Motif scaffolding. Structure first.
Motif, short mmCIF file in Angstrom:
data_model
loop_
_atom_site.label_atom_id
_atom_site.label_comp_id
_atom_site.label_asym_id
_atom_site.label_seq_id
_atom_site.Cartn_x
_atom_site.Cartn_y
_atom_site.Cartn_z
N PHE A 1 2.65 -7.17 -4.05
CA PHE A 1 2.31 -6.96 -2.65
C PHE A 1 0.88 -6.52 -2.42
CE2 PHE A 1 6.94 -6.58 -1.64
CZ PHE A 1 6.95 -7.55 -0.66
N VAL A 2 0.23 -5.89 -3.41
CA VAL A 2 -1.12 -5.38 -3.21
C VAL A 2 -2.18 -6.15 -3.98
CG1 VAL A 2 -0.19 -3.08 -2.78
CG2 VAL A 2 -1.11 -3.66 -5.05
N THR A 3 -1.81 -6.99 -4.95
CA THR A 3 -2.84 -7.70 -5.69
C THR A 3 -3.44 -8.84 -4.88
OG1 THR A 3 -3.38 -8.77 -7.79
CG2 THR A 3 -1.32 -9.37 -6.77
N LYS A 4 -2.70 -9.35 -3.90
CA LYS A 4 -3.21 -10.44 -3.08
C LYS A 4 -4.36 -9.95 -2.21
CE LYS A 4 -1.74 -11.20 0.72
NZ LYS A 4 -1.14 -11.70 1.99
N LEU B 1 -4.96 -4.74 3.00
CA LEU B 1 -5.40 -3.37 3.13
C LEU B 1 -4.44 -2.45 2.39
CD1 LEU B 1 -6.62 -3.10 6.82
CD2 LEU B 1 -7.90 -3.53 4.71
N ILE B 2 -4.98 -1.61 1.52
CA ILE B 2 -4.18 -0.72 0.70
C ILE B 2 -4.39 0.69 1.22
CG2 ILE B 2 -3.69 0.08 -1.62
CD1 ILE B 2 -5.01 -2.47 -2.65
N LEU B 3 -3.38 1.22 1.89
CA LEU B 3 -3.39 2.62 2.32
C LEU B 3 -2.89 3.44 1.14
CD1 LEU B 3 -3.62 1.19 5.13
CD2 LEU B 3 -2.26 3.08 6.03
N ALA B 4 -3.83 4.04 0.42
CA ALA B 4 -3.50 4.98 -0.65
C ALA B 4 -3.14 6.30 0.02
CB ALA B 4 -4.67 5.13 -1.62
N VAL B 5 -1.85 6.56 0.17
CA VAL B 5 -1.38 7.78 0.81
C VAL B 5 -1.15 8.82 -0.27
CG1 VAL B 5 0.40 8.82 2.22
CG2 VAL B 5 -0.36 6.51 2.71
N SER B 6 -1.84 9.95 -0.16
CA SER B 6 -1.71 11.02 -1.13
C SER B 6 -1.39 12.31 -0.39
CB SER B 6 -2.99 11.18 -1.94
OG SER B 6 -3.41 9.94 -2.48
N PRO B 7 -0.54 13.16 -0.96
CA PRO B 7 -0.25 14.44 -0.31
C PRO B 7 -1.35 15.45 -0.60
CG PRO B 7 0.99 14.28 -2.33
CD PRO B 7 0.14 13.04 -2.26
N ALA B 8 -1.58 16.32 0.38
CA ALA B 8 -2.61 17.34 0.21
C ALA B 8 -2.17 18.40 -0.79
CB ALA B 8 -2.93 17.99 1.55
N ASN B 9 -0.88 18.74 -0.79
CA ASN B 9 -0.38 19.79 -1.68
C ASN B 9 -0.63 19.44 -3.14
OD1 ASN B 9 0.47 20.58 0.81
ND2 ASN B 9 2.66 20.55 0.35
N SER B 10 -0.27 18.23 -3.54
CA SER B 10 -0.56 17.81 -4.90
C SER B 10 -2.05 17.56 -5.07
CB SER B 10 0.22 16.54 -5.25
OG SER B 10 -0.16 16.05 -6.52
N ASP B 11 -2.52 17.69 -6.30
CA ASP B 11 -3.93 17.48 -6.59
C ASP B 11 -4.25 16.00 -6.45
OD1 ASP B 11 -6.40 16.85 -7.86
OD2 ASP B 11 -6.21 18.51 -9.26
N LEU B 12 -5.49 15.72 -6.04
CA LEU B 12 -5.89 14.34 -5.79
C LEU B 12 -5.95 13.54 -7.09
CD1 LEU B 12 -6.85 12.84 -3.11
CD2 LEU B 12 -9.07 12.82 -4.24
N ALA B 13 -6.26 14.19 -8.21
CA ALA B 13 -6.31 13.48 -9.48
C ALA B 13 -4.94 12.95 -9.89
CB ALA B 13 -6.87 14.39 -10.57
N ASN B 14 -3.87 13.43 -9.27
CA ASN B 14 -2.52 12.97 -9.56
C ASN B 14 -2.04 11.91 -8.58
OD1 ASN B 14 -2.36 14.63 -11.76
ND2 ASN B 14 -1.12 16.20 -10.75
N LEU C 1 -4.08 6.38 -5.58
CA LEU C 1 -5.45 6.12 -5.97
C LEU C 1 -5.53 5.43 -7.33
CD1 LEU C 1 -6.82 9.31 -4.42
CD2 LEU C 1 -8.08 7.16 -4.29
N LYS C 2 -4.60 5.73 -8.24
CA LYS C 2 -4.59 5.00 -9.50
C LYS C 2 -4.38 3.51 -9.27
CE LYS C 2 -2.19 4.66 -13.92
NZ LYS C 2 -3.41 4.98 -14.70
N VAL C 3 -3.39 3.17 -8.45
CA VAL C 3 -3.11 1.77 -8.14
C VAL C 3 -4.29 1.14 -7.42
CG1 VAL C 3 -1.73 0.31 -6.63
CG2 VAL C 3 -0.61 1.85 -8.23
#
Lengths: 96, 39, 48
Positions: free
Chosen positions: C19-22, C26-39, C43-45
Protein backbone atom coordinates in the motif's frame (compact mmCIF):
# COMPACT_ATOMS: atom_id res chain seq x y z
CA UNK A 1 29.78 8.57 40.34
CA UNK A 2 27.02 9.51 37.89
CA UNK A 3 28.99 12.45 36.49
CA UNK A 4 32.00 10.20 35.97
CA UNK A 5 29.77 7.63 34.24
CA UNK A 6 28.34 10.15 31.78
CA UNK A 7 31.76 11.71 31.14
CA UNK A 8 33.21 8.26 30.46
CA UNK A 9 30.40 7.53 28.01
CA UNK A 10 30.96 10.84 26.22
CA UNK A 11 34.75 10.47 26.03
CA UNK A 12 34.34 7.61 23.52
CA UNK A 13 30.81 7.93 22.11
CA UNK A 14 30.80 11.67 21.52
CA UNK A 15 28.30 14.40 22.34
CA UNK A 16 25.85 13.78 19.47
CA UNK A 17 23.86 10.78 20.73
CA UNK A 18 26.39 8.28 19.41
CA UNK A 19 26.84 4.91 21.10
CA UNK A 20 29.72 2.49 21.63
CA UNK A 21 29.59 -1.26 22.37
CA UNK A 22 32.71 -1.19 24.59
CA UNK A 23 31.58 -2.03 28.13
CA UNK A 24 32.08 0.27 31.11
CA UNK A 25 33.22 -2.10 33.87
CA UNK A 26 32.10 -0.72 37.23
CA UNK A 27 32.14 -2.29 40.70
CA UNK A 28 30.14 -1.24 43.76
CA UNK A 29 30.72 -2.41 47.33
CA UNK A 30 27.89 -2.81 49.82
CA UNK A 31 27.41 -4.54 53.19
CA UNK A 32 24.40 -6.75 52.36
CA UNK A 33 24.36 -7.47 48.63
CA UNK A 34 25.23 -10.56 46.62
CA UNK A 35 28.22 -10.83 44.31
CA UNK A 36 25.83 -10.00 41.51
CA UNK A 37 26.65 -9.00 37.92
CA UNK A 38 24.20 -6.42 36.59
CA UNK A 39 24.25 -5.31 32.96
CA UNK A 40 22.54 -2.09 31.90
CA UNK A 41 22.23 -1.79 28.13
CA UNK A 42 21.07 0.84 25.64
CA UNK A 43 17.50 0.66 24.46
CA UNK A 44 16.52 -0.65 21.05
CA UNK A 45 16.01 1.88 18.25
CA UNK A 46 15.27 1.53 14.54
CA UNK A 47 15.85 4.96 12.96
CA UNK A 48 19.30 6.48 13.59
CA UNK A 49 19.33 9.93 15.18
CA UNK A 50 22.19 12.39 15.42
CA UNK A 51 25.40 10.88 14.06
CA UNK A 52 24.59 7.21 14.63
CA UNK A 53 25.38 4.88 11.70
CA UNK A 54 22.43 3.85 9.52
CA UNK A 55 22.54 0.29 10.95
CA UNK A 56 22.09 1.46 14.55
CA UNK A 57 19.23 -1.02 14.98
CA UNK A 58 21.38 -4.03 14.14
CA UNK A 59 24.26 -2.56 16.14
CA UNK A 60 22.23 -2.28 19.34
CA UNK A 61 20.52 -5.61 18.63
CA UNK A 62 23.61 -7.79 18.29
CA UNK A 63 25.46 -5.69 20.88
CA UNK A 64 22.94 -6.67 23.55
CA UNK A 65 22.48 -10.14 22.05
CA UNK A 66 26.15 -10.89 22.73
CA UNK A 67 25.34 -10.26 26.42
CA UNK A 68 21.89 -11.85 26.70
CA UNK A 69 22.19 -14.98 24.55
CA UNK A 70 24.63 -16.52 27.03
CA UNK A 71 23.13 -18.87 29.61
CA UNK A 72 22.84 -18.01 33.34
CA UNK A 73 21.76 -14.52 32.22
CA UNK A 74 18.43 -13.56 33.75
CA UNK A 75 16.52 -11.07 31.61
CA UNK A 76 14.61 -8.04 32.86
CA UNK A 77 12.28 -7.21 29.96
CA UNK A 78 11.30 -3.60 30.62
CA UNK A 79 8.26 -2.25 28.83
CA UNK A 80 6.35 0.99 29.35
CA UNK A 81 2.65 1.00 30.06
CA UNK A 82 2.21 3.75 27.47
CA UNK A 83 2.74 1.81 24.25
CA UNK A 84 0.61 -1.26 23.69
CA UNK A 85 2.43 -4.33 24.98
CA UNK A 86 2.47 -5.86 21.50
CA UNK A 87 5.23 -3.42 20.46
CA UNK A 88 7.64 -4.43 23.24
CA UNK A 89 11.18 -4.57 21.89
CA UNK A 90 12.05 -6.18 25.23
CA UNK A 91 9.54 -9.00 24.80
CA UNK A 92 10.65 -9.61 21.22
CA UNK A 93 14.23 -10.35 22.31
CA UNK A 94 13.00 -12.17 25.42
CA UNK A 95 10.91 -14.63 23.41
CA UNK A 96 13.64 -14.84 20.77
CA UNK B 1 17.23 -10.03 55.79
CA UNK B 2 17.42 -12.80 53.19
CA UNK B 3 19.33 -15.96 54.02
CA UNK B 4 21.20 -15.78 50.71
CA UNK B 5 22.52 -12.37 51.80
CA UNK B 6 23.46 -13.82 55.19
CA UNK B 7 25.24 -16.72 53.47
CA UNK B 8 27.17 -14.27 51.29
CA UNK B 9 28.08 -12.29 54.41
CA UNK B 10 29.41 -15.48 55.99
CA UNK B 11 31.36 -16.27 52.82
CA UNK B 12 32.97 -12.83 52.88
CA UNK B 13 33.73 -13.36 56.58
CA UNK B 14 35.53 -16.65 55.94
CA UNK B 15 37.28 -14.74 53.15
CA UNK B 16 38.09 -17.86 51.14
CA UNK B 17 37.92 -17.24 47.39
CA UNK B 18 34.53 -18.92 47.09
CA UNK B 19 31.29 -17.60 45.64
CA UNK B 20 27.67 -18.70 45.42
CA UNK B 21 27.94 -18.51 41.60
CA UNK B 22 24.77 -16.55 40.94
CA UNK B 23 23.67 -15.97 37.34
CA UNK B 24 24.22 -12.52 35.90
CA UNK B 25 21.30 -10.15 35.32
CA UNK B 26 20.76 -8.12 32.16
CA UNK B 27 18.16 -5.35 31.91
CA UNK B 28 16.88 -4.79 28.37
CA UNK B 29 14.02 -2.96 26.71
CA UNK B 30 13.07 -0.21 24.33
CA UNK B 31 14.52 3.27 24.35
CA UNK B 32 13.13 5.43 27.17
CA UNK B 33 11.47 2.37 28.72
CA UNK B 34 12.87 2.91 32.22
CA UNK B 35 15.61 0.29 32.26
CA UNK B 36 18.27 2.32 34.08
CA UNK B 37 15.74 3.61 36.61
CA UNK B 38 14.53 0.09 37.42
CA UNK B 39 18.13 -1.07 37.75
CA UNK C 1 -0.75 -11.49 21.02
CA UNK C 2 -3.74 -13.81 20.83
CA UNK C 3 -3.96 -16.45 18.11
CA UNK C 4 -1.79 -14.46 15.70
CA UNK C 5 0.80 -16.57 13.85
CA UNK C 6 4.49 -16.27 14.76
CA UNK C 7 5.18 -13.95 11.79
CA UNK C 8 2.62 -11.26 12.60
CA UNK C 9 5.28 -8.56 12.26
CA UNK C 10 6.31 -9.75 8.81
CA UNK C 11 2.78 -10.15 7.50
CA UNK C 12 1.89 -6.66 8.74
CA UNK C 13 5.02 -5.13 7.21
CA UNK C 14 4.33 -6.91 3.92
CA UNK C 15 0.76 -5.70 4.30
CA UNK C 16 1.96 -2.10 4.49
CA UNK C 17 4.45 -2.41 1.62
CA UNK C 18 1.82 -3.20 -1.01
CA UNK C 19 0.00 0.00 0.00
CA UNK C 20 2.88 2.45 0.57
CA UNK C 21 5.52 1.41 -1.97
CA UNK C 22 3.42 2.69 -4.88
CA UNK C 23 4.30 6.23 -5.92
CA UNK C 24 1.78 9.03 -5.42
CA UNK C 25 1.04 7.62 -1.96
CA UNK C 26 1.23 10.19 0.82
CA UNK C 27 2.62 8.40 3.86
CA UNK C 28 1.37 9.78 7.17
CA UNK C 29 3.99 8.51 9.60
CA UNK C 30 1.91 8.71 12.78
CA UNK C 31 4.02 8.50 15.92
CA UNK C 32 2.96 8.90 19.55
CA UNK C 33 4.51 11.66 21.61
CA UNK C 34 4.81 9.48 24.72
CA UNK C 35 7.05 6.95 23.00
CA UNK C 36 10.46 8.11 21.84
CA UNK C 37 10.70 9.20 18.21
CA UNK C 38 13.60 6.83 17.53
CA UNK C 39 11.12 3.99 18.14
CA UNK C 40 8.66 5.16 15.47
CA UNK C 41 7.98 2.18 13.22
CA UNK C 42 6.16 4.74 11.08
CA UNK C 43 9.39 6.65 10.50
CA UNK C 44 11.30 3.41 9.93
CA UNK C 45 8.86 2.43 7.16
CA UNK C 46 8.93 5.97 5.77
CA UNK C 47 12.73 5.99 5.54
CA UNK C 48 12.60 2.53 3.95
Amino acid sequence: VRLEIEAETDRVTGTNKGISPVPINLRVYSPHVLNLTLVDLPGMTKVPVGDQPPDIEFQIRDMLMQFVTKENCLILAVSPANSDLANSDALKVAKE
Amino acid sequence: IPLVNRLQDAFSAIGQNADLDLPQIAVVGGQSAGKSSVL
